Design brief:
The structure is a homodimer.
Chain A (H helix, E strand, L loop, with lengths): L7 H21 L13 H5 L11 H12 L21 H13 L10 H17 L13 E5 L2 H20 L7 E6 L5 H8 L7 E4 L11 H13 L3 E5 L14 H10 L3 E5 L24 E5 H4 L7 E5 L2 H8 L26 H35 L4 E3 L7 E6 L4 H17 L8 E4 L2 E7 L7 H20 L3 H4 L2
Parallel strand pairs in A: 2-3, 2-4, 4-5, 5-6
Antiparallel strand pairs in A: 1-7, 6-7, 8-9, 9-11, 10-11
Helix pairs in contact in A: 4-12, 5-12, 6-7, 6-11, 12-14
The structure holds a molecule of 2 linked components (PLP-142) (2 copies).
PDB class: lyase
Keywords: complex, decarboxylase, lyase
Assembly: dimeric
Chain lengths: 485, 483
Amino acid sequence: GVTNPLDPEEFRRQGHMIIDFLADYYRDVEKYPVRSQVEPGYLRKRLPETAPYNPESIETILQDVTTEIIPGLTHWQSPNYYAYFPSSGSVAGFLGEMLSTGFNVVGFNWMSSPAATELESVVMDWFGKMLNLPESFLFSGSGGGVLQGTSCEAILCTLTAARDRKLNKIGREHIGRLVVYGSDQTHCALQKAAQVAGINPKNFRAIKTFKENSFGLSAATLREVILEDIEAGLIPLFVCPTVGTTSSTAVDPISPICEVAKEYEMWVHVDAAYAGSACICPEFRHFIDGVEEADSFSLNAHKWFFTTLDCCCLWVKDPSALVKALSTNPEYLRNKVVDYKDWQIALSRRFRSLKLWMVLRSYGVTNLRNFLRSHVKMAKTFEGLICMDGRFEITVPRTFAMVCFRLLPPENLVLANKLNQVYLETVNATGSVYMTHAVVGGVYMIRFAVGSTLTEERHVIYAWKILQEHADLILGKFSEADFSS
Amino acid sequence: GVTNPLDPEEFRRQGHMIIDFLADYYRDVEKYPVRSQVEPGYLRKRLPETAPYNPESIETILQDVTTEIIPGLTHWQSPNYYAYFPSSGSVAGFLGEMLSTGFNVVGFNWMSSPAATELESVVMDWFGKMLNLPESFLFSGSGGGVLQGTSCEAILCTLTAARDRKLNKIGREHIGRLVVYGSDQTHCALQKAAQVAGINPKNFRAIKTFKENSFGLSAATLREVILEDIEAGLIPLFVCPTVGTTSSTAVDPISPICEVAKEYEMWVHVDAAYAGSACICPEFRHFIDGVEEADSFSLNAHKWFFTTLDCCCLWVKDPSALVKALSTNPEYLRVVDYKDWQIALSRRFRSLKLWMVLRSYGVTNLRNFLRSHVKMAKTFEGLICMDGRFEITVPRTFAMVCFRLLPPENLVLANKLNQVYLETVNATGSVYMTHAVVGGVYMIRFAVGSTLTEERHVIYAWKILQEHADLILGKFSEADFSS
Ligand SMILES: Cc1ncc(COP(=O)(O)O)c(CNN[C@@](C)(Cc2ccc(O)c(O)c2)C(=O)O)c1O
Ligand SMILES: Cc1ncc(COP(=O)(O)O)c(CNN[C@@](C)(Cc2ccc(O)c(O)c2)C(=O)O)c1O
């Protein structure tokens, strides 16, 4: 006897085990060290080298999940986790994938699941109006929205949409002259997107940012660089302002960047990946002011909107530009029911809209706003606690729920960077908290970003006390010779 | 106060609701019409225009799933679903993504979750040895395997690394001379991959296939086209032999194609998205014979390996080529940085999906699972051969039959006959199959693969095909299809 792999009753049986296994996880997630403490190669030695010929009980697999898999996790959901940007999830977002995985439809056209395409077009207008985007970006007006996996894939489709738009006008042999623009703080997804699309690696620009502008891109400096490319015979094509960069959570001013990009007929993709979600709150919406002149806008719902990884939201003014670059239909039908596969790189589309649908319904706009707000006040609190300690300084202004700081010693920039390097890694090696760094403007600053869904105010104070405890211990036995190397 | 959106008790309470909800769905899934019967725009009318300002009870949400979302589903998981290619699911694969959604870790480097990277390299060697792949593709030898979301992006990363392999030898100004090769049966993922990767639209070849070899690509025909392109000033770059094409499950001979591709220093990517999973069985492994002389191999483990959607398995012989092409570190610089093997930076715990499926079912049963699918299709093929008014159009290779109803200029007539006949079967909502036009002949595809599909469902589908064959042919007139 061999029970069918999709037995409804065995599905129910084993399914409840995991739901209780994961509920127990979120309950006791505080007890593991946040950053994993295993050595590289630990798993190849604790597991067999071949697949088993006969079945293994789930009660055995779940046990090995506890002893082999779990010690090899860096607990992104731990309430004492602040590294990088949040992997923000929720119950509503979790059950979104569960229904999407249970149904297991492949929405590569409208017929394969009408609801999997039409619902995505509804909730992208829900989230559009919440962000108060102009009618040019959503389906009520003359635009559209698509759900994908990464911003990097979303930036790519946009880049090739802009690229093909230009090369269709002037010719394909000029791909070696197209230039892609971003600041030196723009995330490395823009560079990778350029590399894949056939953009020349010598034609990728990392415009310099200064501390005077808090490391935001200067429309003056950008246009300076463009004139160099035009004088050199290059074709400027694609510029990517960022609202909430990865290192110093810096913000670029889009309204004068579209000014410059309009002059030289460019594409303005605006990349709020992390910080885009906070713009559903009126007090933060000013950060994407000037997005009405850009060609596309990108935010990542798994970073700061409780929809589980992965879920990336792309809005475009001209969804036909993606159709003409990504559809495999002949080039005389792309200019003539939504076929969302022509808006992205993934043909086998997933029922990703169920995640967003359940998050917006199960919490509503009012509570969804306060969630993001609470993460901002918690970091705002952390920023104020830093300020009342004369041993720390704030390196750059806080914009959205992430604080950058540094423990100054009693050029010394080399010395203050080795101090923070040793101070940070000592706090991180305890396993009690986890937070990363960034070298911005030569300074070595520690990044404290609050966003874990299970993070409460008591955890920020716990991290503050641990930062203070090591501050005492590090500076108490201070000696330049220990850090002057 | 305000309940936390990740409360353990609220997680577990609503978590068991959906588990019962889906087990209920898998029980009654046979009652819905397989192909959706809603009209375009049905859901914008039944739903609000704005997101709610106040939370809605999970109980009320699930009622709108049954009454508004389920009518808009084409039941890929129905036991009577034979359209396109299977969406192979299983309990184990479901628990793999739910375990990987509960942790919800981002695997963009080894430290963000070592097990997310380490486990991915064990299961891909488990699989690799299970398909009897050469040691050149495994981590034990001198290769490597990476799990990606789709084939279109797996074919991409190899395409955008084969290009970088050659363009870094001859200079990047020759991108307009690189030719991408495939048959006219090769899936449109190769065209799209070449489109995104900068290959010129004029330089995509869809080499012709003939019925004389069941529409598999001929290395002789491939070589004729290559010399044609060399004398045109072009540079042959990349060939993609397909094992089990989407239209008629044709097989391109891999070994002679690599022979031609080594003459002209080409990249041979084997596409086995559907068929590859069946080479676990030693009696099927001969289809990817010659993969030892290729550069990359890819199968989708959502079509025929019970891992739900999505799970694509790429085995590259030289993982340096991907890294050197997809990493963003300076070119003088390029543990496992798996993100440098694909287009996705924030990578997910796909390994659990493939881990549970291999572990809880075992090698012995997994073969019998695929063997069962093939055998049911091999039985449906035998039923067609007893009804004298049907014709098997092309040889059945894996678990999919291509048949057509014959009538009692003639091709146009018969092609219209099967179109009307097929859509009358599909419109009942009882069963669901799709078609293809291979060699100008309209044929019906019967793809057995749904995990819930038993033998009585195939026999049930045979009866319905016969009741409509009796029906359309009983009142046959040339004029009804001469239009
Ligand atoms: C500002 C910005 N834009 C784009 C991206 C890349 O998009 P993606 O990798 O999702 O496709 C980033 C990347 N940010 N990634 C982090 C900050 C780490 C990270 C944290 C939480 C997540 O949910 C993800 O996916 C990544 C990194 O350091 O690389 C970005 O910041
Ligand atoms: C032989 C072959 N190679 C590649 C692809 C593209 O892979 P992906 O789209 O997964 O990146 C295909 C596509 N096949 N897709 C179907 C058969 C529809 C389909 C059926 C069942 C599924 O689980 C998926 O994902 C798609 C099509 O007809 O296009 C392919 O056949």
